[PDB]
Design a protein around this ligand. Structure first.
Ligand code: CLA
Ligand code: CLA
Ligand code: CLA
Ligand code: CLA
Ligand code: CLA
Ligand code: CLA
Ligand code: CLA
Ligand code: CLA
Ligand code: CLA
Ligand code: BCR
Ligand code: SF4
Lengths: 80, 731, 91, 40, 107, 30, 161, 140
């Protein structure tokens, strides 16, 4: 499965989660950000790698970042 | 225990990409699961042993086939008329017409006419009968047997070499310089003096009597007395006939220069002296480095101290020893660059200075060899740059290379890439513009308006080397100069005649077509370097992707975000530069082949007139010389070039099929495979037969690889046929 | 030589190399280096001129002593760089 | 020829076409009046 | 049969004048391959004044069409109710455009 | 002219080399 | 003269090329009658061909064995007109172009809407910049000396090494 | 909520399609999505076609979590249905409740969620690959 990571440059604008089509990402409380929330990836096994999170991230460089890795039926997104 | 045992990720991969990626990363030993450096080095060593065994098996196979099915003995009697046979053809698909056509070369069975020059090589080296070739094949078979056993042995527990021994640079370089290059070249010079010069002079020296026969009448007494000029005294006469004693001398080591008049190849005495001297140099240089005896050099110390004053090159070469000796990719890149340059050098030197008897008049072999070695040189250069990129993205340590000569390359990579872009742009703009100017001017019935720049600088080099038709009268062309006088009793009396003789490929006459095509070659080299250098320097990161090193060397992309990130991985830089390697080598080989076809046919005023415009290349080279190939088989019958015509079309088809993988990308084929999976699963009868790996479309990098593969194989097949068949049909 | 057993010869922070770079000649003075370099240059250029410029080289005239003395010209360059290094290091 | 139409004529493509038109015409007239100049 | 049809002429500037090749009829020009000469012969055009005047008529129609395009967007633009009258559009395109066009050409 | 016995001897040495090649491939595979 | 080439005026192959082109034109002249526009155009064209060949002969161009002019680009002043003087002319013109572009960019960057000024060119000042770029070699040298040409690299975006 | 399904809810009226699961959802894993609608109305399936979601409860079978989430986004942004629940059904008939795992959609923060896959430094501070060479880890 692909590895999804979130760095502390997060501003808690909650757009990666909305761009997510597999419910891999979710906002959790955080002290660092002004908004008080940070994206997190508790369901990375369901990741497919379309990187809509990366597209929707508005940081100068991506707070949410996905590394492609070992492939699986879910990661390939095969209905069979 | 599934196929990619070395990669558990692919082992759990359920789709058909498991097999593809397992085969693809079979040899990527650095990134295998549970790999250590010591095991990596030992596995590389054993694989090297197996590879050497493969090389010697290939050589033994060529030798045995020429011995068994080739007309070597008949070819020896009449080298200039009998066509050398590679091997017999065994094909149940051949018809009677093809059987009669391929029955050639003075034998009763179908055969393939050798275009590798192995016949000329072995004849020059001293082989005269099939028995000698067979014994050479037997000995090479035994050598490969021993190399395979050595490879097996050096993986055993008690025989597994250690990492310190592998990283012992000084001993390895000392031994390679002194013995692998030096003593091996000395052995070749000894072989020449003992077996090749006597055979050229009509003496049968073999294992049974080489111990008794003296190579020189005086023996080693001149060598020990120091009167080594007695080995040059009495050279071969200009009336010498190769392989006979008439006109034969006694000298074993000479520096006559030029060419042997009958064979139009350099003197074997000259070649033996070359290998003897060059070995002296290399055996000396192999005592440079310190190995267990104090005296010598320390490469780390040398690199550390070589830092210019006031920090001109930053910290100098500090850390380069550590990076080179730790990273195998940097060593591989240096080796590939050096070997590609050497392959280009041999390609450029064999045609200008033939060394094998009667090769110059064998026009097909010369073109085949030049094209072969130029293509391999291009591949080696692209590989050198690709492994430099892999080193940058995988093995480069900025902490070690703090303010280093290597780190400053990354520091001003933007300047380097921008200036390579500038020079590539200038060269292409101006070369294409001048070619189009010439095209339009000749098209409009006024060739006088052509802008034709004389290659005055190359002509000046030719004059300084000895050419006299330009009238520059500089250096060796001017008999009076110090350069011409100091060497006037060693090599110039032969070299002057050789270079000014118009029957040779040594320093061909050049003109405006040569000017323009050379600038085109410069464009090709510069743009290939631009793509490759950019890939290497941006492999670590870019403004569009500063964290590229985290993703690695070969990944598909970064997604459609940030405007799209296609072909960003710096593997795709290699895949792009491969097209330019093919382009520039194709330009080089077209230039070589057309100029040499014209020179051999005796109308150089076809190249000098038509090569200034591009329609001249399209008509007087491609279209004109494509007739004997495409007429290999037609509606009225077939000739012996039908195989070349079929392979010509074959390379065209593969080149075309590559465009599919290069243009059409994965989403279309993935959805189509969904449809095919539906159909197979839903049809009756067949749905009992069910796959194990889920069939998926090819990955992005996989398909880029496949498309480039189809392109390259295609390139080589098409030009091989066109270069081997048109030459045969025109001469 | 290994990574560990290697002298600290980097000198990018300083104006002249350490004398250790000269190896076996890390203690021979700058005076000896310079005098030997000058004699080597003179002798080697004499040998080269006598071999190829004053005379014409050939199979019957190549002289081993002149050939060997020619190799003192690059040795002269090395010796003069060494003389400068030792003069700057204070020896 | 309001300020808006002057602005439109000042837009990049119109200006490119106008200037390259004048340049090509200049080159062609130099060719007509000084033809076949493969030298200076 | 012998005359090569040609309806284009280059100017002598940079040597392109050779492109005015021999096309028969005491005329130098670029041979055409569009069949317009045969089209005009079928139509019955036998003079150059007819070609000139139909060209002028075509320019007048082009001006009228530019005017119509400006008028039907800037002065009097139809409505979606007008546009969606597909039945009347088909009736007028069959009988009115194609039918009367064919009738007029037959005449 | 290469003889039948010569070809057979070369083939035998080739077979020995083949066995060694299988062995080396095994040992590289482990 | 040089490179084995001979002057085009004393070149038998050059004279034959001229004669052959003339014979080709006269051969195609047979189709047209005297006085027609095509006839007069061909007469003008053949006059132009002869004038071109005479001009090449007089200019001192060197003709090779192929009988076509070969330009000697080695820096000798005998053949300066082949490359050196055209080279200087182009270098001046290209410098003019680049200086006009750069100076207009420097003006536009200070405008309130540089992005819109990039598309919509301020033609009244663009003409001024184009005219003033005639003295670019002195202007560029002045900017070099004052240090306002090459921005310090410590101020240019650079990718992570 | 809970790892269970009724497995008897009336399904949307659909005329069948070729885009459904094929000999793999029954052997490896199927997916289900269940929602409630105020009116019986027409919607577009993730598989090609048009179906009629029934009044009240509706249950649909699919082969991909991506398909279920796409249908969910359609339901939210067209019909304003925001009570959907998504399940994964194994061949051994275990049912795992996946998407609204905390009972609320992931885009709204909850107090009990803990961070998974969070890095305490900026993106441009990862170790180089040479540092992790011949180690099982990775540069993130
Ligand atoms: C139906 C088409 C067809 C087929 C099936 C063949 C079959 C053959 N031809 Mg060919 N041939 C064809 C058309 C065909 N030919 C045509 C149109 C011509 C023109 C007249 C010829 C001309 C011709 C010649 C002149 C010769 C052959 C030879 C052969 C034989 C190859 C022997 C061998 O060991 O190859 C081994 C095959 C390979 C090494 C190729 C595989 C390489 C793969 C793709 C790389 C990957 C390897 C691995 C998976 C990793 C074989 C009987 C040769 C022969 O008889 O040799 C004894 C030979 O000399 N053919
Ligand atoms: C004198 C001693 C000696 C010799 C002869 C060799 C020889 C070799 N070593 Mg080396 N080696 C030595 C000492 C020596 N080693 C020592 C002391 C160490 C430990 C410190 C090593 C450590 C070592 C390693 C780690 C490896 C080798 C390998 C090799 C092989 C290199 C590939 C090859 O064959 O290229 C052939 C090259 C030449 C013949 C040189 C000439 C090249 C020019 C450019 C060609 C000229 C073309 C010519 C005109 C063609 C005409 C036809 C080669 C058999 C590699 C290998 O293959 O292992 C199996 C390898 O992996 N060696
Ligand atoms: C660069 C070295 C070199 C090379 C490439 C060759 C090549 C050749 N020699 Mg040899 N030869 C050499 C050195 C070399 N020789 C030296 C130094 C001498 C002593 C003067 C001889 C004396 C000699 C004689 C007297 C004869 C040959 C012959 C041959 C041919 C057959 C070789 C054979 O069957 O090997 C098979 C063996 C092997 C492949 C194993 C080689 C050794 C291994 C790799 C250990 C390396 C250390 C071939 C052209 C025969 C011939 O017909 O020549 C025309 C022949 O009769 N050679
Ligand atoms: C001394 C030579 C040498 C050596 C030792 C290596 C070694 C390596 N290279 Mg390679 N490389 C070389 C030359 C060399 N290279 C050259 C010349 C090029 C330029 C083309 C490259 C370009 C290159 C790239 C771009 C990459 C490597 C990589 C690698 C590594 C993994 C390769 C792998 O998995 O292979 C196993 C590969 C296969 C089993 C596929 C082989 C397919 C063959 C070539 C098809 C032949 C065509 C066709 C079938 C025949 C048609 C016949 C007719 C019809 C490995 C360390 C990779 C790496 O390090 O990644 C991190 C990598 O990305 N190399
Ligand atoms: C004939 C085909 C062709 C052509 C003309 C080019 C042209 C170029 N490639 Mg290459 N390229 C090709 C095939 C070709 N490529 C293929 C098949 C690939 C594999 C994918 C690549 C991959 C590739 C890469 C990855 C790179 C290049 C680069 C370049 C530049 C090389 C330097 C040069 O010549 O600049 C001079 C340009 C020309 C000679 C042609 C320009 C246009 C002419 C002169 C017309 C002028 C305008 C005209 C008046 C407009 C009229 C409109 C009406 C240039 C843009 C490199 C680059 O961008 O370097 C700066 C680069 O990075 N190419
Ligand atoms: C021009 C700029 C330049 C400046 C320096 C500066 C330095 N080099 Mg040198 N060096 C240069 C170019 C330069 N190098 C180049 C181009 C090379 C590549 C060949 C080298 C290779 C080199 C080596 C290998 C070493 C140095 C070392 C040094 C240091 C001591 C120099 C000294 O006193 O030598 C003193 C020299 C002599 C007293 C005389 C010996 C020199 C001659 C030329 C030897 C000739 C041998 C002979 C011809 C062999 C037969 C030839 C053939 C048949 C094999 C110093 C930092 C040494 C050091 O320890 O650095 C850490 C060191 O080991 N340099
Ligand atoms: C007899 C009546 C009549 C005629 C002759 C035409 C003719 C035309 N209509 Mg149609 N049209 C009609 C009735 C008619 N319409 C009615 C009643 C409606 C309302 C329902 C429309 C609604 C309508 C629309 C919405 C459009 C047309 C368009 C067109 C043109 C189709 C393209 C073509 O082949 O042009 C052939 C052109 C000629 C033969 C040249 C003749 C030019 C004039 C009439 C003289 C054509 C000029 C299309 C258009 O705008 O094209 C410009 C278009 O989009 N018509
Ligand atoms: C739309 C197509 C079309 C048109 C426009 C015409 C036109 C004509 N056809 Mg017909 N015709 C057609 C299709 C067409 N045809 C088809 C398809 C066929 C095959 C079935 C025929 C078969 C046919 C035949 C067999 C004959 C005609 C004839 C005629 C003439 C009839 C006069 C008339 O009825 O006045 C109608 C009058 C009015 C409606 C009253 C108004 C009168 C106005 C004001 C008079 C204007 C006069 C003019 C502007 C000035 C002329 C001055 C003069 C000194 C030059 C006229 C030239 C006859 C003819 O003359 O043949 C050469 C004839 O014998 N046609
Ligand atoms: C404003 C004008 C301008 C200036 C001063 C420069 C300057 C430079 N460019 Mg160029 N460049 C320009 C426009 C300009 N560029 C444009 C519009 C493009 C897009 C096509 C490029 C694309 C480009 C590339 C891809 C590269 C350069 C490079 C370079 C450098 C080398 C010079 C060269 O070879 O030019 C090459 C010139 C061209 C490729 C075409 C130029 C286009 C026209 C002819 C000029 C524009 C004039 C403009 C309309 C003036 C408006 C002013 C007016 C309103 C008053 C240099 C820093 C090279 C580099 O980095 O070298 C270090 C390089 O690789 N440039
Ligand atoms: C990226 C990278 C890489 C790669 C690289 C490459 C691939 C390169 C190549 C390169 C090359 C490929 C180069 C070449 C060079 C050459 C030269 C430099 C030459 C020289 C020459 C000379 C000096 C000569 C002289 C002479 C003589 C001696 C005689 C005659 C005359 C004359 C003058 C000619 C590496 C791995 C490193 C790593 C890092 C990164
Ligand atoms: S920076 Fe990216 S991960 Fe962070 S809140 Fe914004 S969209 Fe979400």
């Amino acid at each position: 499965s692909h590895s999804v990571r979130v760095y502390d440059t997060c501003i808690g604008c909650t757009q990666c989660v909305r761009a997510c089509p597999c419910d891999v990402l979710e906002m959790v409380p955080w002290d660092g950000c002004k908004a008080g929330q940070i994206a997190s990836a508790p369901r990375a096994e369901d990741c497919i790698g379309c990187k809509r999170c990366e597209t929707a991230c508005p940081t100068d460089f991506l707070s949410v970042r996905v590394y492609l890795g070992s492939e699986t039926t879910r990661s390939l997104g095969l209905t069979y | 225990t599934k196929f990619p045992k070395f990669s558990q990720a692919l082992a759990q991969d359920p789709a058909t990409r498991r097999i593809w990626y397992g085969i693809a990363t079979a040899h990527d030993l650095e990134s295998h699961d549970g790999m250590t450096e010591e095991n990596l080095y030992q596995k590389i060593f054993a694989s090297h042993f197996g590879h050497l065994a493969i090389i010697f098996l290939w050589t033994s196979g060529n030798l045995f086939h020429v011995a068994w099915q080739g007309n070597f003995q008949q070819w020896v009697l009449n080298p200039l008329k009998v066509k050398p046979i590679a091997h017999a053809i065994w094909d149940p698909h051949f018809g009677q017409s093809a059987i009669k056509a391929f029955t050639r070369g003075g034998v009763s069975y179908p055969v393939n006419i050798a275009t590798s020059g192995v016949y000329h090589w072995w004849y020059t080296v001293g082989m005269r009968t099939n028995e000698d070739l067979y014994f050479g094949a037997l000995g090479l078979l035994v050598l490969s047997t021993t190399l395979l056993f050595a490879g097996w042995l050096h993986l055993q527990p008690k025989f597994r070499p250690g990492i310190a021994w592998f990283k012992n640079n000084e001993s390895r370089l000392n031994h390679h310089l002194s013995g692998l290059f030096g003593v091996s070249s000395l052995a070749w010079s000894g072989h020449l003096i003992h077996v090749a010069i006597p055979e050229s002079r009509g003496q049968h020296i073999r294992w049974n009597n080489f111990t008794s026969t003296l190579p020189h009448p005086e023996g080693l007494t001149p060598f020990f007395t120091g009167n080594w000029g007695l080995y040059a005294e009495n050279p071969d006469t200009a009336q010498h006939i190769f392989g006979t004693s008439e006109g034969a001398g006694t000298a074993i080591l000479t520096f006559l220069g030029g060419f042997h008049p009958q064979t139009q190849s350099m003197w074997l005495t000259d070649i033996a002296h070359h290998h003897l001297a060059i070995a002296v140099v290399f055996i000396f240089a192999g005592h440079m480095y310190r190995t267990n005896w104090g005296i010598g050099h320390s490469m780390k110390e040398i690199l550390d101290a070589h830092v210019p004053p006031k920090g001109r090159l930053g910290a100098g070469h500090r850390g380069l020893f550590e990076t080179i000796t730790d990273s195998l990719h940097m060593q591989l890149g240096l080796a590939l660059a050096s070997l590609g340059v050497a392959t280009s050098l041999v390609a450029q030197h064999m045609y200008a200075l033939p060394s094998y008897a009667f090769m110059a008049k064998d026009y097909v072999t010369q073109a085949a060899l030049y094209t072969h070695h130029q293509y391999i040189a291009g591949f080696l250069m692209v590989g050198a740059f690709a492994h430099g990129a892999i080193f940058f993205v995988r093995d480069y340590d900025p902490e070690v290379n703090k303010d280093n000569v290597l780190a400053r390359m990354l520091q001003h990579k933007e300047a380097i890439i921008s200036h390579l872009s500038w020079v590539s742009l200038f060269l292409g703009f101006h070369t294409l513009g001048l070619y189009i100017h010439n095209d339009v001017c000749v098209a409009f019935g006024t060739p006088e308006k052509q802008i034709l720049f004389e290659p005055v600088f190359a002509q000046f080099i030719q004059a300084a080397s000895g050419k006299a038709l330009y009238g520059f009268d500089v250096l060796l062309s001017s008999s009076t100069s110090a350069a011409s006088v100091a060497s006037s009793k060693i090599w110039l009396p032969g070299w002057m005649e050789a270079i000014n003789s118009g029957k040779n490929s040594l320093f061909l006459t050049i003109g405006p077509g040569d000017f323009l095509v050379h600038h085109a070659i410069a464009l090709g080299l510069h743009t290939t370097t631009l793509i490759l250098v950019k890939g290497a320097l941006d492999a670590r990161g870019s403004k569009l992707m500063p964290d590229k090193k985290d993703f690695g060397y070969s990944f598909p992309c970064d997604g459609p975000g940030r405007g799209g990130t296609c072909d960003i991985s710096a593997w795709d830089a290699f895949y792009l530069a491969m097209f330019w390697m093919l382009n520039t080598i194709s330009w080089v080989t077209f230039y070589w082949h057309w100029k040499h076809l014209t020179v051999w046919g005796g109308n150089a005023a076809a190249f000098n007139e038509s090569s200034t415009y591009i329609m001249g290349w399209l008509r007087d080279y491609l279209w004109l010389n494509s007739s004997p190939l495409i007429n290999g088989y037609n509606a009225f019958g077939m000739n012996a070039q039908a195989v070349w015509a079929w392979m010509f079309l074959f390379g065209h088809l593969i080149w075309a099929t590559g465009f599919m993988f290069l243009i059409s990308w994965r989403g279309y084929w993935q959805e189509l495979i969904e449809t095919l999976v539906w159909a197979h699963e839903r049809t009756p009868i067949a749905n009992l037969v069910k796959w194990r790996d889920k069939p998926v479309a090819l990955s992005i990098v996989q398909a880029r690889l496949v498309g480039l593969a189809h392109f390259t194989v295609g390139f080589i097949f098409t030009f091989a046929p066109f270069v081997i068949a048109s030459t045969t049909g025109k001469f | 030589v290994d990574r560990s057993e290697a002298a600290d010869t980097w000198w990018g922070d300083k104006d002249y190399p350490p004398s250790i770079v000269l190896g076996i000649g890390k203690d021979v003075p700058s005076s000896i280096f310079g005098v030997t370099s000058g004699l080597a240059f003179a002798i080697g250029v004499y040998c080269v001129a006598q071999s190829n410029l004053v005379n014409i080289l050939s199979g019957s005239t190549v002289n081993g002593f002149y050939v060997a003395g020619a190799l003192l010209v690059p040795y002269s360059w090395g010796l003069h760089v060494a003389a400068w290094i030792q003069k700057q290091n204070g020896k | 020829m309001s300020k808006d139409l002057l602005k439109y004529l000042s837009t990049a493509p119109v200006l490119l076409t106008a200037w390259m038109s004048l340049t090509a015409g200049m080159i062609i007239e130099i060719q007509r009046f000084f033809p076949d100049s493969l030298s200076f | 049969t012998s005359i090569k049809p040609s309806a284009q002429v280059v100017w002598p500037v940079v040597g392109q004048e050779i492109l005015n090749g021999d096309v028969g009829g005491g005329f130098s020009g670029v041979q055409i391959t569009s069949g317009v000469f045969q089209m005009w012969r079928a139509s019955g055009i036998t003079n150059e004044t007819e070609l000139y005047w139909t060209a002028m008529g075509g320019l007048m129609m082009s001006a009228l069409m530019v005017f119509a395009g400006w008028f039907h967007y800037h002065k009097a633009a139809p409505k979606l109710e007008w546009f969606q009258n597909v039945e009347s559009m088909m009736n007028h395109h069959l009988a009115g455009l194609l039918g009367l066009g064919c009738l007029s050409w037959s005449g | 002219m290469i003889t039948d016995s010569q070809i057979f001897f070369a083939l035998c040495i080739a077979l020995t080399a083949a066995v060694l090649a299988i062995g080396l491939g095994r040992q590289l595979y482990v | 003269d040089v490179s084995g080439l001979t002057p085009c005026k004393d070149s038998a192959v050059f004279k034959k090329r001229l004669d052959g082109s003339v014979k080709k034109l006269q051969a195609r002249l047979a189709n047209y009658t005297e006085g027609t526009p095509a006839y007069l155009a061909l007469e003008q064209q053949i006059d132009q061909t002869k004038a071109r060949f005479a001009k090449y002969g007089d200019k001192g161009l060197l003709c090779g064995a192929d009988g076509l002019p070969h330009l000697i680009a080695d820096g000798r002043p005998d053949h300066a007109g082949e490359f050196v003087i055209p080279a200087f002319g182009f270098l001046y013109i290209a410098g003019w172009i680049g200086w006009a572009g750069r100076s207009y960019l420097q003006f536009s960057k200070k405008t309130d809407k540089p992005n819109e000024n990039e598309i919509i060119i301020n033609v009244p000042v663009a003409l001024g910049m184009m005219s003033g770029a005639f003295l670019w070699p002195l202007a560029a040298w002045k900017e070099l000396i004052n240090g306002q040409l090459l921005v310090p690299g410590d101020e240019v975006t650079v990718s992570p090494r | 909520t809970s790892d269970v399904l009724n497995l008897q809810i009336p399904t949307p009226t659909f005329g069948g399609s070729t885009g459904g699961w094929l000999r793999a959802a029954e052997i490896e894993e199927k997916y289900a999505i269940t929602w409630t609608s105020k009116k019986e109305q027409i919607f577009e399936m993730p598989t090609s076609g048009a179906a009629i979601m029934q009044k009240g409860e509706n249950l649909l079978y699919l082969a991909k979590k991506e398909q279920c989430l796409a249908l969910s986004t359609q339901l939210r942004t067209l019909f304003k249905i925001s009570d959907y629940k998504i399940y994964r059904i194994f061949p051994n008939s275990e049912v795992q409740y996946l998407h609204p795992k905390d009972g609320v959609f992931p885009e709204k923060l909850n107090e009990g969620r803990i961070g998974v896959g969070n890095v305490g430094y900026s993106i441009g501070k990862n170790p180089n690959p040479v540092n992790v060479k011949f180690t099982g880890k990775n540069t993130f």
